[PDB]
Amino acid sequence: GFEGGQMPLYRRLPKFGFTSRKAAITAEIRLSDLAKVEGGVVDLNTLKAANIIGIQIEFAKVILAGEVTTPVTVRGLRVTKGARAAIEAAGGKIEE
Amino acid sequence: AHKKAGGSTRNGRDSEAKRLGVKRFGGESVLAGSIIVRQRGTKFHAGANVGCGRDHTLFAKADGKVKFEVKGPKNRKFISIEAE
Amino acid sequence: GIREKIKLVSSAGTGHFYTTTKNKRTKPEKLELKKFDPVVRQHVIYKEAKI
Amino acid sequence: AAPQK
Amino acid sequence: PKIKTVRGAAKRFKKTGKGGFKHKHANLRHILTKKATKRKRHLRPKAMVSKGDLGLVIACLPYA
RNA sequence: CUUUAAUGUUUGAUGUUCUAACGUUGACCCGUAAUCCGGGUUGCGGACAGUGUCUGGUGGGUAGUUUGACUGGGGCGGUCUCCUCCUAAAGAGUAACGGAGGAGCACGAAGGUUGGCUAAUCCUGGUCGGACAUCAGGAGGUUAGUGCAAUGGCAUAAGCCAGCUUGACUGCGAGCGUGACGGCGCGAGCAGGUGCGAAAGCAGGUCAUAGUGAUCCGGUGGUUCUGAAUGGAAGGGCCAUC
RNA sequence: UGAACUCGCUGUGAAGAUGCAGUGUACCCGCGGCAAGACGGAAAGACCCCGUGAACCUUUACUAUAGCUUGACACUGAACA
RNA sequence: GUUUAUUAAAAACACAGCACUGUGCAAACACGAAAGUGGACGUAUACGGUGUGACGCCUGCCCGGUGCCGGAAGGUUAAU
RNA sequence: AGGACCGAACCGACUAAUGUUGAAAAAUUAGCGGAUGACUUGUGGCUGGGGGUGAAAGGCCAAUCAAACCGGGAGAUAGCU
RNA sequence: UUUUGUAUAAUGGGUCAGCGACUUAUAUUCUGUAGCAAGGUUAACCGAAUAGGGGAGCCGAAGGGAAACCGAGUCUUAACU
Numbered sequence A: 001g002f003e004g005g006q007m008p009l010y011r012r013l014p015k016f017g018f019t020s021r022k023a024a025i026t027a028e029i030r031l032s033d034l035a036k037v038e039g040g041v042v043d044l045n046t047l048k049a050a051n052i053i054g055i056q057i058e059f060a061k062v063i064l065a066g067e068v069t070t071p072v073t074v075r076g077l078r079v080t081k082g083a084r085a086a087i088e089a090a091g092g093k094i095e096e
Numbered sequence B: 001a002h003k004k005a006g007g008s009t010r011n012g013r014d015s016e017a018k019r020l021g022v023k024r025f026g027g028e029s030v031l032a033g034s035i036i037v038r039q040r041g042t043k044f045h046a047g048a049n050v051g052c053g054r055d056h057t058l059f060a061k062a063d064g065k066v067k068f069e070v071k072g073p074k075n076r077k078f079i080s081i082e083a084e
Numbered sequence C: 001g002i003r004e005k006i007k008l009v010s011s012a013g014t015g016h017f018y019t020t021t022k023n024k025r026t027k028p029e030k031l032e033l034k035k036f037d038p039v040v041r042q043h044v045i046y047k048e049a050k051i
Numbered sequence D: 001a002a003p004q005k
Numbered sequence E: 001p002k003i004k005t006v007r008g009a010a011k012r013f014k015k016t017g018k019g020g021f022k023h024k025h026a027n028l029r030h031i032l033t034k035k036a037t038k039r040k041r042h043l044r045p046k047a048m049v050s051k052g053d054l055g056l057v058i059a060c061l062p063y064a
Numbered sequence F: 001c002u003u004u005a006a007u008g009u010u011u012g013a014u015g016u017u018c019u020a021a022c023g024u025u026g027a028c029c030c031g032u033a034a035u036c037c038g039g040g041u042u043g044c045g046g047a048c049a050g051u052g053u054c055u056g057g058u059g060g061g062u063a064g065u066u067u068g069a070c071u072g073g074g075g076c077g078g079u080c081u082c083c084u085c086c087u088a089a090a091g092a093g094u095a096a097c098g099g100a101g102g103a104g105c106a107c108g109a110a111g112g113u114u115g116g117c118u119a120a121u122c123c124u125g126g127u128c129g130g131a132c133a134u135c136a137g138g139a140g141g142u143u144a145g146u147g148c149a150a151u152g153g154c155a156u157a158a159g160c161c162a163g164c165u166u167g168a169c170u171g172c173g174a175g176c177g178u179g180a181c182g183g184c185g186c187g188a189g190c191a192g193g194u195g196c197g198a199a200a201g202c203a204g205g206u207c208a209u210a211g212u213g214a215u216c217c218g219g220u221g222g223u224u225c226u227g228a229a230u231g232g233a234a235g236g237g238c239c240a241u242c
Numbered sequence G: 001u002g003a004a005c006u007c008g009c010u011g012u013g014a015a016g017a018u019g020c021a022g023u024g025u026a027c028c029c030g031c032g033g034c035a036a037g038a039c040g041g042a043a044a045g046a047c048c049c050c051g052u053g054a055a056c057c058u059u060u061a062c063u064a065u066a067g068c069u070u071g072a073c074a075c076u077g078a079a080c081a
Numbered sequence H: 001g002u003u004u005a006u007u008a009a010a011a012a013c014a015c016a017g018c019a020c021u022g023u024g025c026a027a028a029c030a031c032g033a034a035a036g037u038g039g040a041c042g043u044a045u046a047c048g049g050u051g052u053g054a055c056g057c058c059u060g061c062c063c064g065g066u067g068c069c070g071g072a073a074g075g076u077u078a079a080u
Numbered sequence I: 001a002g003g004a005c006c007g008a009a010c011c012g013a014c015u016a017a018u019g020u021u022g023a024a025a026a027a028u029u030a031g032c033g034g035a036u037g038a039c040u041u042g043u044g045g046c047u048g049g050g051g052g053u054g055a056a057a058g059g060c061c062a063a064u065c066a067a068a069c070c071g072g073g074a075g076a077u078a079g080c081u
Numbered sequence J: 001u002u003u004u005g006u007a008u009a010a011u012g013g014g015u016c017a018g019c020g021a022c023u024u025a026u027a028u029u030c031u032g033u034a035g036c037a038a039g040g041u042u043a044a045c046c047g048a049a050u051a052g053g054g055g056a057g058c059c060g061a062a063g064g065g066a067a068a069c070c071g072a073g074u075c076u077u078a079a080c081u
């Protein structure tokens, strides 16, 4: 980043934002991941046992990525508007 | 002998050049918003489909071909855009 | 110069304000203008205040 | 040492 | 040893989907009364690092 | 309330005595074969001096460093950012300690809009009045004016005058120009809410080009963000501004 | 001490030529002498400039500090005006 | 008299003499984290620092600036 | 009597020449200054590196001094050759 | 060798023989090549030990926003053509 003594680019520009501590304990789940758990019940404990999310994770969203074909029940996770439709089409149900 | 000191110049200043002048010439196709001339004062005037900015910049308000023309009793130079 | 900065504060309950420069000596009376307040989304009277 | 120019 | 990030750059650029960097515009911190609102309004949104600069940024941010 | 007196109490200051901490490089005895040191007795000082922590001053006695570049060699002298003209070779750009001048602002009207108007200079005739004031007529035709340099513009006036106003608005922005970049500039049109006008329309400061300074740090106001067990708060972010 | 089969002159040429061009002179090799040249030998110019080099010195440059000096608290008590 | 050992021996340094100034003795002052030591087994006719430099005639004016000495009213001012 | 006079030993170092890959990393030859004093010399001791010592020349401190030598930090750093 | 430019009278070398200068470790990125592939790969450690076990972790398949948060969308804004 030395430029011959001109004020270097990473110091002309302002610092911005802050770091969220809650972001680090949050994860996203794909539809294609829902088939990998054992026992057809998806929750944080079950996703951790499948090594799909880290042990520190406390919140997870299922998002419309990939596809799911087996029925599933999702318990205590949040679900995107599009992911909900996909789980319902597969004959699953979401509960809270 | 002794080497004798010179004086000094009182001059030595100038401003940055402003890149004025014609930016699109006759027959050249342009999109709306395209700047056609950068000016000081209205050395050219806005014709049909041409706008004039606060600094007398002429710009296209329609797509078409640039037409230069001389008009009016004062023989003033007008720029216009003709639809393609 | 004597042209000095002031702010104009919205007479609505909002906090919104404009800033401007005023010649304090020659025009000692307060500046007052109607201006748009984007918090209430109305033209409202604004009054001079300290920067 | 010597005389220098 | 591991390369160390230039921590002052980590506070100023963030990486984006296709690998470019966004940054905040200069000139918007103080001396704001004299600047036209048009000018100030255009400085609010984040902007993308230019072609000639990417080489310098990537050097500072090896782990981005 | 104001002036003011006593009593009580608390706390501070000064002065004079006292002895018991402390000092003794006063005398004497002992350890002892010893002008060190320690103990004992006694005299003189005495809550001072002196030492520790904290604190103001002084402090080249000592220490670590800084003290620019350009430059028809360095020093001395001049310059260092911005605007206008020439050099610049009829697109843009183009150097020199080349030739010439300016800026580091002003204005709530000197901004917006509607309506109206048209200059300098000179010659005639007129109280004071004169080479030059105000008045009438003529010639002239922009040789004037432009808040401040110069250039380019300006009669549809961008020059001059009057009424009503705050568009010197908030969120955006097709598309371009100019920079290595940071950046700087022009802009139709959308949404909201205004001003002038009968209306078409015009208005996102000023005839245009100078009137300026990144980031860090910190201050002020707001906010549907964050808040280290939890509820707050501090601190941070975001928005406006210094 | 790069190697040499190691002349003069005028010109040219990184601008002062034994070595290039033109031209003149000159059998091969020693010894004794003199120092005009080989920009002769000796020393990575000591003058000058440069380096965001060094040292040491000065001061009302900057920032510290030993020492000197002020006060508060401690060692530190009694009585009275 | 002394001095640049190894390019300078001098007009430089020292000098006897002069003046100012500090120091009352556990002296000032110097070397020491301190103890202690020198000054001095001395005591203002003594000791330290500074300038001048035998002797003779002399050494004039300025206290505004910087320094030092004395003062304490008032303004300001640290820890607490 | 005398920091008195002339002058050997002794102590010094004013001039000239020689030498300068020296007889010698400071000498020799011929002259020169002091020579009872602030003199000179033998043996031993003490002062230590931002320190000593200095009749003061930045002079001397083991052929070294505007900060000795040895070892270490250490392959300091060298936008320079 | 260094330079705009060297027969240069700019630098360096008396000659010979031996020695003498782009390395290693760990991260990161790009290229070639090999394995596996929406998956790839294990570290320490265990191990009658280049095997096998160990998937703790790491990269990838989702982004936008300062963040809460939303999610093939999201931010900006009262709202977007």
Ligand SMILES: COC(=O)c1c(OC)cc2cc3c(c(O)c2c1C)C(=O)[C@]1(OC)C(=O)C=C(OC)[C@@H](O)[C@]1(O)C3=O
Residues within 6 Å of the ligand: D001, D002, D003, D004, D005, G046
């Ligand atoms: C213009 O003047 C000269 O041309 C010139 C000169 O012309 C006769 C003679 C000399 C003699 C010398 C020096 C010179 O510079 C010098 C100069 C310049 C030195 O610097 C010397 O060189 C070993 C040294 O290191 C330290 C010394 O004194 C600090 C001298 O004594 C020195 O010893 C010496 O003999």
Ligand SMILES: [K+]
Residues within 6 Å of the ligand: none
């Ligand atoms: K006693």
Ligand SMILES: [K+]
Residues within 6 Å of the ligand: F072
């Ligand atoms: K020059």
Ligand SMILES: [K+]
Residues within 6 Å of the ligand: F072
């Ligand atoms: K010259």
Ligand SMILES: [K+]
Residues within 6 Å of the ligand: F088
């Ligand atoms: K030109």
Ligand SMILES: [K+]
Residues within 6 Å of the ligand: none
């Ligand atoms: K008006």
Ligand SMILES: [K+]
Residues within 6 Å of the ligand: G035
């Ligand atoms: K010769």
Ligand SMILES: [K+]
Residues within 6 Å of the ligand: H009
């Ligand atoms: K002598």
Ligand SMILES: [K+]
Residues within 6 Å of the ligand: H003, H012, H013
């Ligand atoms: K001397």
Ligand SMILES: [K+]
Residues within 6 Å of the ligand: none
């Ligand atoms: K004298």
Ligand SMILES: [K+]
Residues within 6 Å of the ligand: H063
């Ligand atoms: K005086």
Ligand SMILES: [K+]
Residues within 6 Å of the ligand: H063
């Ligand atoms: K005085």
Ligand SMILES: [K+]
Residues within 6 Å of the ligand: H063
């Ligand atoms: K006085």
Ligand SMILES: [K+]
Residues within 6 Å of the ligand: none
């Ligand atoms: K003796």
Ligand SMILES: [K+]
Residues within 6 Å of the ligand: I049, I067
């Ligand atoms: K030293």
Ligand SMILES: [K+]
Residues within 6 Å of the ligand: J001, J011, J012
């Ligand atoms: K060479």
